[model samples]
Target: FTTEIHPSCVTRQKVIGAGEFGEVYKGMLKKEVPVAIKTLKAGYTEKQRVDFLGEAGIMGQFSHHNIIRLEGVISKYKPMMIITEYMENGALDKFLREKDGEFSVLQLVGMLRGIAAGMKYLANMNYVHRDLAARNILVNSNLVCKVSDFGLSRVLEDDPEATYGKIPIRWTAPEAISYRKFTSASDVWSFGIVMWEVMTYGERPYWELSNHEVMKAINDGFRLPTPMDCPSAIYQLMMQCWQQERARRPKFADIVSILDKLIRAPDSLKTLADFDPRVSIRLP
Candidate 1:
């Protein structure tokens, strides 16, 4: 096995990525093994550090083949630093948009399976990726998907450690919008929104609506339109994921089974008899 660096280790490296709170730099273990070193922004209060550390603690409890591994953490220093595996292709949003409309059915099937696999891992651990979306999924050069980012991730059924205050309106399920509680079903609902994002090349959800408008529409039950050329079976599964009744939404186990069949069999896409590919409204 290759030796890995402890997360607290600091090294001279180049910054390759940046986010609202911090930046990620390229680093190495020993000689040539590549890793991503993320340093949190300076000047966080003690409570902020505690909260961020709590997020990391929940993240550290799990592992999945399709989820980016949190290699290590450095907290002794101010504003803790985190280390994770590096992906050459970066986030799925930029990658898909750059590809134009070249995404094929087989490729979509594979990517969807990867997301489901990663989500299944989280579900098994009773966790929720509160921010599941295209921006959080990473694709390597070989098209392997790894879900990344845990800044908003949290453990379910616990004290509310963080308050989002406002719903992510468009990306939220009705249950979440109303009760401010999240469950695996709500996560599945977010997953459907992600599928739309992936199929449509990272378009912002509810692009034309104000936050209040989106909240009203969601409360009144408006769903996203199916993307053109998206397989009917896939659309059906995504719709099932968006069911309003939390318990009615398909379980991740069910989702895994459906996605597995889609990937393994390759013929299921042919039978989406009720699929529709039209939207009455025009894109801006």
Candidate 2:
């Protein structure tokens, strides 16, 4: 069960960020621990309130290290708030961009493994994280990664297709983009994009391509080439996750297994350094 702290107990600080839902503040709880508080904007509709608070309730059901923990919320009062564990490093994408080239291959693999494990947990819970990109993943002071941002999440078994709308064209799977059907397999497709983000140290996918162009390219059997210096095995795994037929894509469990093996046998990763030396992006 989650706690319901008094609004007076929360000392709201400067705005850390903002999303479609509302502004996220870097705040202190009871003048003690730091936390990220998401406050719904004023004059929200009943539908928006249900959607926001519903996501908070769904987050409360999750109890995994790789998943962001919901500390509490302020649904009973105006200026609704969602309190979550403070992630010191913030979004995984920006964090990786800042520390590019700083982590070893195994270190990157560990982060991917953590993400797969978290996705596995959600899959088991019958949940589909529609938005599972690097930006939605949070990194802590210890470099541990946790999946966050559930505003677009849905219970897979509960008529997912009926609720699908405004897909994130860049990270979405073919079936999702075409038919608006979200499933665990679709999440796997997004995971492939996440893997690309991690391997490339947070390079934006489909660089310089418009959303329509990306969709057209994918329809024409085009997939992102392996990022520079990315291991062949990892790239192959990413391709597997992007199989055209959703049923052919590897499940998160299989993904975790492959990542685990890669972590244990780093020698297998030394494969001709398979990328062009001409690429301009460099890790910090």
Candidate 3:
């Protein structure tokens, strides 16, 4: 029900931000619920239009609570649109940064758990999300982080650096970047980065290194140092995610299980890892 939204039924409100294709809007649908509408360009190409709808196709199929719900699609008219539930809190990175030091450690881990739960659905569905980062995750009023932006998603079949050469060196697994092999394991690698982002309240991963330097460092057995005040268990999972061999990384379901137990047992988060400069980068 209400799958195809009529153009006249949606409001083209002000531009809130940019998306994978063009400007996105905070609009109203059918005069009721608030919605975010992703708009396409005026003179778009065939490739642009189809792939834009392709994300809607993927979003339409996923029905998990942690996954971003596809409200509806508007394909019958020009300036094509994909409508979804409006997230009041916006992107996870900016939200965490603005509210740094405001939340308890357990609360922050709860957000990470929500993200992993979403990834579990994606991975279990045999879909590998090539782009999984804090910036792509949207938080709602209840602090729920839903995985969004499926532009880089590919079914678990063919894998060759999907699009052009846009793979992120810092967030990607070392093997995926080298052999162009993107799997759910690679997504697990990204979840590690996201965990660091959460622990650091949205600090950039490898903020000091350039793309080439990070590329070199990763290949040379380097990983990001623990974020200040990060819990041992979170960083421990982070280390597991960054394991050199992709198979060594934990599956999304395993990650979910890990976080669930950690949540249920709050004492595990009490010991913040020591971050002294001497042995901090690769701790004992």
Flag regions of model 1 displaced more than 4 Å: 1-12, 19-21, 77-79, 151-164, 271-284
lDDT string for model 1 (53-135, tens) is: 66566557767888887766777665577677788888887888888788777787788788888998988887777667777
Task: Write candidate 2's Cα lDDT for 160-217 as tens digits.
Answer: 2222356678899989888878899999999999999999999989998988898899
Off by over 4 Å in 3: 19-21, 152-164, 277-284
Q: Which ten residues in a row have the lowest lDDT in candidate 2?
A: 155-164
Q: What is the TM-score of each candidate against the true structure?
A: 0.83, 0.89, 0.90
What's the lDDT for residue 119 in model 2? 97
What's the CA RMSD for each of the models? Answer: 4.9, 4.7, 4.6
The Cα local distance difference test for each model comes to: 0.73, 0.85, 0.85
**What is the TM-score of candidate 3?**
0.90
TM-score of 1: 0.83
Question: What is the clash count for each candidate, in the order shown?
Answer: 3, 0, 0
Ranking of predictions according to TM-score: 3, 2, 1
Specify the poorest-scoring 10-residue window by lDDT in model 1. 153-162
